[PDB]
Design a protein around this ligand. Structure first.
Ligand SMILES: Nc1ncnc2c1ncn2[C@@H]1O[C@H](COP(=O)(O)OP(=O)(O)O)[C@@H](O)[C@H]1O
Ligand SMILES: [Mg+2]
Lengths: 43, 50, 70, 48, 160
């Protein structure tokens, strides 16, 4: 309702979303290197 | 008898005209078609992609 | 070569085929024993193994990552 | 306490167990000393 | 064969060069192998003919060996450096078949890449080669021939 706390801040949840996508990006880079069917990565 | 100091040789084809002999060009032409082929490879079929 | 491998053990001529093949000078099939073409057994041993490990090193690569120099 | 010696050349099948310790270093062979000797006692020289 | 270079991605930020994945890598690795395999393909056998390489100071080197021609060809690509160092490993150990071992490896990566496009895993492909090679070495032992009834040094002459 109108008496609810708005909390004044949407920047924290946006920064957490930017970190989760950045963390899932590199996690999905090495997803195909797991198990006997994994593949090598030459850097 | 000569007009000047030196006389550079003529290139038969025009300067910048690309040309090549042997089996390398026809393989490059086939690989060029296969490069265009790979774009339309997964498109074929009902479950294909746009 | 196939006609040699399939053959009965007891067939001299066919077995011999197992022994000969391509000639690059005259362009016909002649015997290597009379021609003198011969190699060591060690040359083929550990040659396919090196080519096998060479194939394994590139074939297992999925993605390529490059770091620029500092 | 485990040791792994890196070396170029050979095949994967050539890896085998060695009952004793192996030295990664090589001999000098400047004055033409021996390379093989049986029933030898190994002493560790910690000085110059 | 690869065209239309991979787009710089904003969701995956890694320092240095851009990351690229998919079948383009194994296509680029095979394309890098054909860059060196076509060089050594012509200088094979008695009928084969070799080429020249200048050293940028007037000097040059007319080379038949696979280890020497690849030693001067400093390959910047990573996949090509494996075959370059293999020939340096081949000629030091055995000193023979330096051209064939590179040609065998190039043909394997050709058909191996075709098999990956046929949707079988590389682990099954590698298992197929190892069981095949174990039978090949067993077959090499069958077709051996011991030198016998030879006059003098003829077996050492004709094999040279
Ligand atoms: N006189 C010959 N007749 C038939 N085959 C030959 C002859 N000389 C060489 N070859 C073949 O050519 C291949 C490559 O030989 P060579 O070029 O000497 O070795 P490398 O591949 O190490 O350069 C060998 O596998 C061999 O079977
Ligand atoms: Mg040779």
């Amino acid at each position: 309702p109108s008496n609810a706390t708005f909390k004044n801040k949407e920047k924290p949840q946006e920064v957490r979303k930017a970190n989760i996508i950045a963390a899932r990006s590199v996690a999905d880079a090495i997803r195909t290197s797991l198990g006997p069917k994994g593949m090598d990565k030459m850097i | 008898m000569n007009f000047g100091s030196q006389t550079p040789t003529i290139v038969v084809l025009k300067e910048g005209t690309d040309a090549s002999q042997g089996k390398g060009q026809i393989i490059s032409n086939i690989n060029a078609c296969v490069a265009v082929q790979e774009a339309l490879k997964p498109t074929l079929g009902p479950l294909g992609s746009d | 070569h196939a006609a040699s491998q399939m053959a009965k053990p007891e067939d001299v001529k066919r077995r011999s085929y197992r022994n000969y093949g391509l000639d690059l000078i005259r362009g016909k099939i002649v015997d290597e024993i009379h021609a003198g073409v011969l190699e060591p057994t060690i040359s083929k041993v550990k040659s396919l193994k090196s080519a096998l490990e060479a194939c394994v090193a590139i074939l297992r690569i999925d993605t390529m990552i490059t770091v620029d120099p500092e | 306490d485990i040791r792994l010696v890196k070396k170029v050349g050979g095949t994967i099948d050539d890896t085998e167990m060695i009952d004793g310790v192996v030295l990664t270093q090589t001999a000098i062979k400047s004055a033409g000393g021996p390379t093989r000797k049986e029933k030898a006692k190994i002493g560790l020289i910690q000085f110059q | 064969m690869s065209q239309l270079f991979n787009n710089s991605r904003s969701d995956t930020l890694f320092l240095g060069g851009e990351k690229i994945s998919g079948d383009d890598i194994r296509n680029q690795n095979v394309l890098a192998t054909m860059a060196v395999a076509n060089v050594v393909k012509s200088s094979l056998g008695p009928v084969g003919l070799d080429k020249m390489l200048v050293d940028d100071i007037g000097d040059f080197t007319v080379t038949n060996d696979g280890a020497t021609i690849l030693s001067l060809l400093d390959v910047q690509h990573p996949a090509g450096k494996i075959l370059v160092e293999l020939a340096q490993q081949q000629d030091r150990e055995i000193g023979d078949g330096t051209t064939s071992v590179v040609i065998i490896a190039s043909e394997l990566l050709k058909r191996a890449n075709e098999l990956v496009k046929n949707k079988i895993h590389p682990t099954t492909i590698i298992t197929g080669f190892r069981v095949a090679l174990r039978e090949a070495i067993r077959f090499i032992n069958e077709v051996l021939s011991t030198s016998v009834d030879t006059l003098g040094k003829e077996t050492l002459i004709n094999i040279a």
